[PDB]
Write a protein that binds this ligand. Structure first.
Ligand SMILES: CCCCCCCC/C=C\CCCCCCCC(=O)O[C@@H](COC(=O)CCCCCCCCCCCCCCC)COP(=O)([O-])OCC[N+](C)(C)C
Ligand SMILES: CCCCCCCC/C=C\CCCCCCCC(=O)O[C@@H](COC(=O)CCCCCCCCCCCCCCC)COP(=O)([O-])OCC[N+](C)(C)C
Ligand SMILES: CCCCCCCCCCCCCCCCCCCC(=O)O[C@H](COC(=O)CCCCCCCCCCCCCC)COP(=O)(O)OCCN
Ligand SMILES: CCCCCCCCCCCCCCCCCCCC(=O)O[C@H](COC(=O)CCCCCCCCCCCCCC)COP(=O)(O)OCCN
Ligand SMILES: CC(C)CCC[C@@H](C)[C@H]1CC[C@H]2[C@@H]3CC=C4C[C@@H](OC(=O)CCC(=O)O)CC[C@]4(C)[C@H]3CC[C@]12C
Ligand SMILES: CC(C)CCC[C@@H](C)[C@H]1CC[C@H]2[C@@H]3CC=C4C[C@@H](OC(=O)CCC(=O)O)CC[C@]4(C)[C@H]3CC[C@]12C
Ligand SMILES: Cn1c(=O)n(CCCO)c(=O)c2c1nc(Oc1cccc(Cl)c1)n2Cc1ccc(Cl)cc1
Ligand SMILES: Cn1c(=O)n(CCCO)c(=O)c2c1nc(Oc1cccc(Cl)c1)n2Cc1ccc(Cl)cc1
Ligand SMILES: [Ca+2]
Ligand SMILES: [Ca+2]
Ligand SMILES: [Zn+2]
Ligand SMILES: [Zn+2]
Lengths: 668, 51, 668
């Protein structure tokens, strides 16, 4: 048997103290009033007594939404400490106003204040009631603040400090508290969400709560935008300056839902097709023919802009869709010339051919455009693209190609056959660099999948799965290096000279593979190519009759195969499946954000000419304020409607019925 | 509206068919509001199936 | 503009007919009574008038659970047609009893009867009330009935006949209607679920409804078993004869949930470990050592059973777990001898060796056991196993091996080297058949994964994914045959003799592959081996300088590769993923059903000795009835509790409040 008793005992209620609490719970006004009047004379009942759940009479009255009994208790001067917090959490309008007009256990932490709790509940009525007075919320310090107060509070009590900061940010991120008491709710939501995301990054713990607060602020901004009812209002909102200034601010703060708003996208599309008014309703063949015709005429449009920008053709290229088509056509012609560039080879450092002479201005235009973007946009914007890295690599490789071509031209004159050229001859290195540059240039077309409806979200999904690929890369590389070390340690004794080989060819790229694991570099390459099955098995064989050594090397190779293919590759497939399922829900919003960035990149005057042709306030604030007031009214009404459209509800219904019953019985 | 088609419509089935077809075409044409037109068309199709 | 009007018009209510209906809806008893009394004198209000929704006054009263107004309307002799059906569907006790004691539009089909609708609602109170009278439900005919009435009804109105049959089976499959008015609820549920599954198979349409009705019956049987509270009751239930007779009947009807009942499994486990009382609580090492010791002593136990079955060792093998261990050990020794059988080869038809002489009695025992199982169990039970197919194949291959060995022994005496033997020499065919038999025998161990907790559900999952594999097999084979036909048609002109080959070797199994597509059989094999990458590319090359033909053949081969690998194999992976996710929820129940079948296979006296040693009522009904009565009471109480633990509820609350309000106002 296990005896069961009360380990942590408390003070039990008296027989009367229990009858009085039961009367309060049942809502019988007459008996509660009689008990209150009798307590003043006889002092037999403690009006502040708790219950087995810790609730006093006032807390019971508040929880039952019994305003009459509550007010009766207040008129008898019962203990009221922290009752306002319970009234605010209960989200009952009557309790606050009643209570507003006037160390025990508490369900609320000491740092909770009435306005902070009201902001936590996100109840517009109670928040407005509290803001009607003079209430304040403490300002949180910097995310990486190092003042004496912050470090002192962190060292004295880290839990209390973290809880207080989280409560403050929960209060500030309240959509209702931003709807009121905020000059610019949209900008406030943007910057508050950004700061909450930064806190989520910094705070390893409480990361989920800061993430959800930031997401809540983002959704509040998106809903405020949703309340717009006319194009005039939407233009006023997006063009406000603290064109499309506020849209640019939203893009800066990574407000993807706000940018992907259907009305925002519709306005951006009307700006995107400046020239064509009816591009929305056209057939596939008509659109394709128009795109082909505009692309084939890109040199004409560029020349017209160069000569006279003010004409039917001079300013026709400044239109965003037309400019995009011209740049894409220019890049396509550049790639076509790159393909044609491989259609006498014994000359050491030959002069550039006609195709190379045509290619050169495109490379110069690419470099000039990159440096112009760096000079104009800035440094942080240039490095935030993450596509400028490939552009920088292409430009550097092209510059190295040109330098090596010049070196080979001015250092060699004779025509020696390539068979006897040096391994590190300048022409060979230049050609290798040019080939790598061609690969990168042709691969640069991936960034244009954003402009397409069918290819955009797919590109987003593949880009976000590249992160899982990168994560798997580390473990694969560790395994690869481990087995490379083992195989090299085992096999480096039997290294053979190239002369001994049947065709004077040494390594794994010969017709008969040999010396697969003789050196660490060759071992790494061999383990790489065994992933694709191009490494033959006999490479695990040695000329000496060391069958144990051969078997051990073969077993190492087989274990590497088993891991890298059976275990690691299937785990990679599983990770990709999970990540793609996770990111399939938000593909459209991310794609629309990326496409908005692409479209806005073509809104600027600078960079109008594609290569190689590039080398040749009070009233506005008042309008914004009135639009914001209308949006806030509409948002508040809509959210109240949505919330209107628990066991405590049934408890309140029972309380109302019982109070009515007791009143009727007393009257009769 | 399924109720507004149940009333004030000579042939509710044909009305639902053609209205759903037109809503699908609008969903194609209207790049934005695509989900709403898709759900309206699906609602008309379900109304025909329930009839 | 689109004019909107009422296409299908109706008869509008009068001003009074609307006020009277509104009074009925609000529950005002006094005004309804006054209107009813005034209608008898003035005949100004039609008491049977409908509303815009088609409901009459009685239907409104029933829908609001207003028994007083309902009874008032009944006392005034209002139209009552089909009101009982609405009362039953509403699941209100008062309406039925009231109505029970006493071609317009209807929400119920003409074939619906009060008892049928009550059974559809599965409401025990109303079903019991209706069964208290003399009510009947029509008997559905055979699933494949061909009588004149069935075909006449099907031809006259297929929709009506199908609807009537489905309604009847919905009525009969009611758990409450089976709890009452059924001699044996468990057997009734088993056979009714089986018949519903058969109907689901036969009825291509309405398949989902019959499937869910069958599943509902299965769950009802499982819940009835769940209500058992002691081992005596469970034994009485499982041992009832219309041992473990009812358990066998459940297994016959594929009642997987009933068999996988935790109490059923616990009883089956206590039977399974007859010898060991405390096998449940033992360490892994102890269990493994005990299993090894029992397995290594299987010949001793078999001999002891053969000599004296009545001894500490004679009857120790009749225990189910011990018998299973002995049979498994016997099969393992047989496989060990098969492995040893490959440790002078020029003799044509040699006498069997010592290992073959030891193998022979095991084969004879296998054949004798198979034919004994066929003779005892029957034919349908033998073919329902689906594992007896592999056993039959093994036995046939072994018999063919023995026949060919005898033929080669009695037809050849000389010792000729194998190099110059005939292609179809009897010894070679016998050896090939024996090797195939060895493969099948070793693969037969898959069926023992059922006995294991970790390997059982995995085997179930793999077996159920074999169905998706089989489905994909048809499309793969169609593609394979198509491309084989194309490649053979293209390449059969350049067929070359084996002499012309460098090593006199023709086909794809040579060191230098040749004639890959010369014949249809070889083309099929080549397309098979290209799936695994073992077909080299140069097989698409011909000696003649027909570069167009070579390119076309290479393109056909490449398209076959693309389909079969990129498209078909990934689609197979996707199908397997979906099927495995689908069947992962029910893996445990299916595994427990399979393991119960395996355990019960070792409960019988027959087949006790493994190879090769096999070749050397009223009171029971009363107890079952009382147990079933207790189970039905408990099940009814539990299901009512579960159901107790809609907008119509709020409508009823409003109706009650309004009726109380009107009564109080009238009284005051
Ligand atoms: C993006 C990077 C841009 C810059 C590229 C790097 C600079 C290229 C410039 C190269 C010019 C180097 C001098 C060449 C002079 C030739 C004569 C000579 O002195 O040979 C010397 C050796 O020469 C070498 O070792 C060359 C090594 C080239 C490595 C290139 C790595 C990057 C290419 C892959 C990039 C992948 C990018 C993937 C994305 C002496 O040899 P020896 O003593 O006679 O013996
Ligand atoms: C389960 C099935 C059981 C029965 C097996 C089949 C019976 C086996 C019995 C075979 C004995 C046949 C007679 C042999 C006589 C030898 C001399 C002779 O006359 O050769 C003759 C030809 O002989 C043949 O063509 C043999 C063909 C064997 C095909 C086996 C297919 C099944 C094996 C795979 C099973 C996979 C199972 C996968 C699961 C004449 O040749 P010729 O004119 O000289 O030229
Ligand atoms: C020594 C000899 C060396 C020879 C080397 C020969 C091979 C040449 C190197 C090939 C590098 C391939 C780089 C692929 C670019 C990455 C990329 O496209 O990201 C896409 C998503 O982009 C985005 O979402 C935006 C971010 C873009 C990042 C681009 C980074 C490029 C870095 C180049 C270095 C993926 O999209 P998807 O193709 O999966 O669809
Ligand atoms: C001419 C020369 C021919 C040479 C042929 C050489 C190869 C020999 C043939 C190999 C056949 C493999 C049969 C595999 C048995 C099927 C099986 O084990 O089903 C398991 C599930 O079983 C179950 O769930 C119960 C059903 C069992 C059906 C067994 C059917 C065997 C038919 C044999 C014919 C799968 O389970 P898992 O292994 O995926 O796990
Ligand atoms: C696919 C293989 C054969 C290589 C093809 C090389 C190029 C000819 C292809 C590859 C990617 C294609 C581009 C992919 C993305 C688009 C988006 C597309 O924009 C639209 O979808 C119309 C709606 C809009 O963008 O406003 C314009 C065509 C373009 C630039 C394509 C032009 C032709 C490209 C450059
Ligand atoms: C795995 C490779 C090395 C081939 C092994 C051949 C056999 C030695 C293995 C393969 C499958 C094994 C069997 C798989 C299933 C079981 C279930 C197992 O039963 C239990 O799990 C204990 C609980 C119970 O069954 O009552 C008894 C061992 C046995 C027969 C195993 C015995 C050893 C087997 C036959
Ligand atoms: C990692 N690996 C490997 O490198 N080689 C190459 C060796 C050089 O030829 C294997 O051949 C191999 C293998 N794994 C295997 O199958 C298992 C699966 C589970 C456990 C164990 Cl121990 C083995 N094999 C097959 C094999 C089974 C039994 C025997 Cl006796 C000998 C070979
Ligand atoms: C089905 N198939 C195939 O059988 N062979 C073997 C031919 C015999 O050597 C291919 O080489 C092949 C291929 N598919 C491909 O890539 C696409 C992808 C989409 C559309 C098209 Cl048209 C081609 N290639 C590569 C290739 C691309 C362009 C050119 Cl010009 C020539 C070869
Ligand atoms: Ca750039
Ligand atoms: Ca069998
Ligand atoms: Zn600070
Ligand atoms: Zn019939």
């Amino acid at each position: 048997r296990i005896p069961l008793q009360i380990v942590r005992a408390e003070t039990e209620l008296s027989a009367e103290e229990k009858a009085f609490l039961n009367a309060v719970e049942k809502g019988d006004y007459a008996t509660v009033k009689q008990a209150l009047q009798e307590a003043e004379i006889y002092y037999n009942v403690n009006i502040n007594c708790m219950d087995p759940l810790g609730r006093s009479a006032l807390l019971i009255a508040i929880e039952n939404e019994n305003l009459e009994i509550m007010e009766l208790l207040l008129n008898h001067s019962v203990y009221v400490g922290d009752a306002l917090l319970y009234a605010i959490r209960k989200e009952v309008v009557g309790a606050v106003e009643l209570l507003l007009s006037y160390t025990q256990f508490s369900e609320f932490t000491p740092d909770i204040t009435p306005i902070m709790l009201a902001a936590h509940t996100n109840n517009y009525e109670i928040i407005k009631l509290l803001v009607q007075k003079r209430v304040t919320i403490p300002r949180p310090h910097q995310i990486r603040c190092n003042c004496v107060e912050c470090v002192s509070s962190s060292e004295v009590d880290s839990l209390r400090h973290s809880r207080s900061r989280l409560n403050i940010y929960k209060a500030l991120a309240s959509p209702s508290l931003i709807a009121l008491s905020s000059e610019d709710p949209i900008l406030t939501a943007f910057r508050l969400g950004w700061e909450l995301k930064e806190l989520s990054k910094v705070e390893n713990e409480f990361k989920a709560e800061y993430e959800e607060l930031s997401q809540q602020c983002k959704l509040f901004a998106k809903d405020l935008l949703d309340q717009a009812r006319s194009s005039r209002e939407l233009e006023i909102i997006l063009n406000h300056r603290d064109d499309l200034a506020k849209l640019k601010v939203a893009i800066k703060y990574h407000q993807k839902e706000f940018v992907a708003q259907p009305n925002c996208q519709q306005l951006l599309a009307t700006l995107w097709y400046d020239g064509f008014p009816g591009w929305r309703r056209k057939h596939w063949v008509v659109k394709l023919l128009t795109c082909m015709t505009i692309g084939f005429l890109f040199p004409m449009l560029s020349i017209a802009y160069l000569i006279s920008p003010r004409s039917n053709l001079g300013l026709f290229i400044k239109k965003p869709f037309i400019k995009f088509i011209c740049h894409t056509a220019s890049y396509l012609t550049f790639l076509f010339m790159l393909l044609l560039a491989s259609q006498d080879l014994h000359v050491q450092g030959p002069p550039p051919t006609v195709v190379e002479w045509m290619i050169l201005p495109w490379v110069l235009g690419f470099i000039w455009g990159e440096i112009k973007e760096m000079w104009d946009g800035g440094f942080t914007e240039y490095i935030h693209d993450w596509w400028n890295l490939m552009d920088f690599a292409m430009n550097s490789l092209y510059l190295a190609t040109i330098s090596l071509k010049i070196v080979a031209y001015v250092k060699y004159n004779g025509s020696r056959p390539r068979e006897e050229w040096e391994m590190w001859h300048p022409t060979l290195i230049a050609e290798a660099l040019f080939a790598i540059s061609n690969i990168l240039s042709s691969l640069r077309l991936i960034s244009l999948f954003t402009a397409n409806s069918h290819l955009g979200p797919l590109q987003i999904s593949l880009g976000r799965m590249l992160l899982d690929i990168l994560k798997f890369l580390f473990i694969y590389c560790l395994v690869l290096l481990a087995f490379a070390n083992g195989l090299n340690q085992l096999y480096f004794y039997y290294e053979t000279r190239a002369i001994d080989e049947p065709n004077n060819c040494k390594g794994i790229r010969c017709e008969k593979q040999n010396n697969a694991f003789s050196t660490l570099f060759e071992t790494l390459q061999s383990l790489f190519w065994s992933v694709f099955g191009l490494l033959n098995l006999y490479v695990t064989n040695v000329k000496a009759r060391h069958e144990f050594t051969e078997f051990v090397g073969a077993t190492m190779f087989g274990t590497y195969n088993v891991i890298s293919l059976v275990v690691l590759l299937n785990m990679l497939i599983a990770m990709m499946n999970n990540s793609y399922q996770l990111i399939a829900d938000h593909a459209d919003i991310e794609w629309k954000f990326a496409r908005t960035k692409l479209w806005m990149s073509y809104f600027d005057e600078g960079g109008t000419l594609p290569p190689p042709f590039n080398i040749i306030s009070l009233i506005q604030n008042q309008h914004y304020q009135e639009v914001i007031r209308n949006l806030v009214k509409r948002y508040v009404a809509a959210m109240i409607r949505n919330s209107k459209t628990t066991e405590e509800n049934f408890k309140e219904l029972k309380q109302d019925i019982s109070s009515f019953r007791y009143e009727v019985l007393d009257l009769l």
